C-alpha cells in the first residue's frame, strides 16, 4: 500500500520551500519514504491564484490520502475543493480568519496543521539587546488593516506590562511612510515594524531614516531584516514544516484531523542585519545563537 500525498504550494520562496523540506524529513524519519511506501505529488502554482484552485481540484480527482497546503491561498483552495480528504496546512498566520477551522483547539473541519503566528513579545524582547536604555517604543502601521490594529494593541499591552511608553503613527498609503518615520525621529528609541505589507514593504526608506538617526528597527519577520531592519525573532520554517510532517504521520495512521489542534511554534531564531548593526556603530552580541544577514539590493 502506497499513501498518495499532494503538496500544493503557492510560489517558490525560501520560507515556503523550507516548510516542504521539513515536512518531507519528518515523514522520512518516521518511515514514510517517497518512491517506497508514499508517493509525493508536488505542484507549485507560480503565484497564480486560479492555479491554486486547479491544483486543489486535481488532488481531489486523484483522491489523495492527504493534502499538504503551503500558504493561506493554497490551503483555502484545498478546502474549497474537498471536505473529505484531510488537509494539513503550514505558513498560515490566522487559520480561523482564513475560514479553514472553527477554532485552533478543535478545527471541526477536514483541516489542521501549523500556523506561523509569532507574538509581538518575541520581537520586543530584542529591545534588551539592541535598545537597552529605551523608554519609548515607536510603531507605524496601516489603519485600514484589522490585523495591524490587533498587533498594535498587543504592542501597547507589552509596553504597559514592561514600563514603556508608545508613540504611534497610523497611515493608509505608501506615500505617507517618508514623512511618517521622519516625524517619529526624536520621539522614539526603537521602532517596531509589524506584519503589515504597507509598512514592511517600505523598509528601505524606513531603514535609511531610522539608521541615520540612530534608531534601531525591529521587524516581525525576516524578509524586512534583509531589506534594512536591524533584527527580528523569526519563525524557523523548516522546523514548522517538520512539526506539520509529524502531524501527517498521525493522519496517515488514521487519526482524526477534525480533533487535531492547530499547532504554533516556539522555535524562532534571532536574525540580525550585519550592515545596519555596523551603521549604528554597534558590536555583535556575544551569544553565538544569532544569525547574521547582509542587506539585499
From the list 82, 23, 34, the residue with the least C-alpha distance to 56 is 82
Q: Rounded CA gap, 226 and 230, in Å?
A: 9
Q: What Cα–Cα distance (Å) separates residue 212 from each residue in 109, 190, 208, 257, 292?
A: 51, 13, 6, 51, 21
> What residues contact residue 187 under an 8 Å CB cut-off, 6+ apart?
136, 138, 167
- Cβ-Cβ contacts under 8 Å for 15 (sequence gap 6 or more): 91, 116, 222, 237
Q: How many Cα atoms occupy the beta-carbon half-sphere of 216 within 13 Å?
A: 27
Helix axes 49-62, 72-81, angle to 10 degrees: 40
Tell me the three state secondary structure of residue 59.
helix
Rounded distance between C-alpha atoms, residue 127 and residue 191, angstroms: 10
**Beta carbons of 279 and 93 less than 8 angstroms apart:** no
- 143 closest CA partner among 105, 109, 171: 171
CA angle 110, 33, 106 (to 5 degrees): 20
193 in Cβ contact with 219 (< 8 Å): yes
Strand order in the sheet with 136-142: 165-171, 136-142, 190-193, 217-219, 231-235, 268-273, 290-293
Task: Give me the sign of the Cα torsion angle 161, 165, 171, 176.
Answer: negative
Structural domains of the chain in order of their starting residue, each with its CATH number: 1-117+235-267 (3.40.50.2300), 118-234+268-297 (no CATH)
Three-state secondary-structure class, residue 174: helix
What is the C-alpha to C-alpha distance for residues 27 and 138, in angstroms, rounded to an integer? 43
Please give the C-alpha separations between residue 127 and each of 71, 138, 164, 232, in angstroms, as whole numbers: 30, 12, 11, 10
Give one DSSP letter per residue of 23-49, joined into a string: HHHHHHHTT--BTTTEEEEEEE-TT-H
Q: Are strands 87-92 and 136-142 parallel, antiparallel or unpaired?
A: unpaired
Quickly list H helices, the chain: 14-29, 49-62, 72-81, 120-124, 127-130, 146-162, 177-184, 197-200, 203-212, 223-226, 237-252, 274-279
HSE-up of residue 20 (Cα within 13 Å, Cβ side): 22
Residue 42 to residue 159: CA distance in whole angstroms: 44
**Is there a contact between 68 and 246 (Cβ–Cβ < 8 Å)?**
no
Q: Helix (H, G, I), strand (E, B), or coil: what is residue 268? A: strand
Q: How many residues does the chain have?
A: 297
Query: This structure's resolution (angstroms)?
Result: 1.8
What phi and psi, each to the nearest 5 degrees, are found at residue 189?
A: -105, -15
Break-preceding residues in the chain (C–N over 2.5 Å): none
For residue 289, what are the CA distances in angstroms to 227, 268, 283, 284, 295?
A: 22, 11, 15, 12, 20
Long-range (24+ apart) CB contacts under 8 A made by 203-208 are: 203/227, 203/228, 203/229, 204/228, 205/177, 205/178, 205/181, 206/140, 206/177, 206/181, 207/276
CA atoms within 13 A on the CB side of 131: 25
Cβ proximity of 67 and 90 under 8 Å: no
Amino acid at each position: 500500500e502506497v499513501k498518495k500525498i499532494g503538496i500544493t504550494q503557492l510560489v517558490e520562496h525560501p520560507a515556503l520551500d523550507a516548510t516542504r523540506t521539513g515536512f518531507v524529513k519528518a515523514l522520512e524519519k518516521n518511515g514514510f519514504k517517497d518512491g517506497e511506501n508514499i508517493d509525493i505529488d508536488f505542484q507549485n502554482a507560480q503565484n497564480d491564484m486560479p492555479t491554486t484552485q486547479s491544483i486543489a481540484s486535481k488532488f481531489a480527482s486523484d483522491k489523495k490520502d492527504l493534502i499538504f497546503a503551503i500558504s493561506t491561498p493554497s490551503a483555502q483552495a484545498a478546502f474549497n475543493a474537498t471536505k473529505d480528504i484531510p488537509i494539513l496546512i503550514t505558513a498560515v498566520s490566522d487559520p480561523v480568519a482564513a475560514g479553514l477551522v472553527k477554532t485552533l483547539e478543535k478545527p471541526g473541519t477536514n483541516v489542521s496543521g501549523t500556523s506561523d503566528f509569532v507574538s509581538v513579545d518575541k520581537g520586543l524582547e530584542l529591545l534588551k539587546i539592541f535598545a537597552p536604555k529605551a523608554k519609548t517604543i515607536g510603531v507605524m502601521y496601516n489603519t485600514s488593516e484589522v490585523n495591524s490594529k490587533v498587533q498594535v494593541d498587543a504592542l501597547k499591552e507589552y509596553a504597559s506590562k514592561n514600563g514603556f511608553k508608545v508613540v504611534e503613527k497610523g497611515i493608509t498609503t505608501s506615500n505617507e511612510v517618508n514623512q511618517g518615520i521622519s516625524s517619529l525621529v526624536g520621539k522614539i528609541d526603537v521602532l517596531y515594524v509589524p506584519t503589515d505589507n504597507l509598512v514592511a514593504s517600505s523598509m528601505p526608506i524606513v531603514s535609511k531614516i531610522a539608521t541615520e538617526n540612530k534608531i534601531p528597527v525591529i521587524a516581525a519577520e525576516s524578509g524586512p531584516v534583509e531589506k534594512g531592519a536591524l533584527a527580528c525573532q523569526g519563525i524557523n520554517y523548516e522546523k514548522l514544516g517538520y512539526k506539520t510532517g509529524e502531524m501527517a504521520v498521525k493522519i496517515l495512521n488514521g487519526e482524526s484531523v477534525s480533533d487535531m489542534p492547530v499547532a504554533t511554534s516556539d522555535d524562532t531564531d534571532i536574525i540580525v542585519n550585519e550592515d545596519i548593526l555596523k551603521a549604528l556603530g554597534m558590536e555583535k552580541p556575544s551569544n553565538e545563537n544569532i544569525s547574521y544577514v547582509k542587506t539585499k539590493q
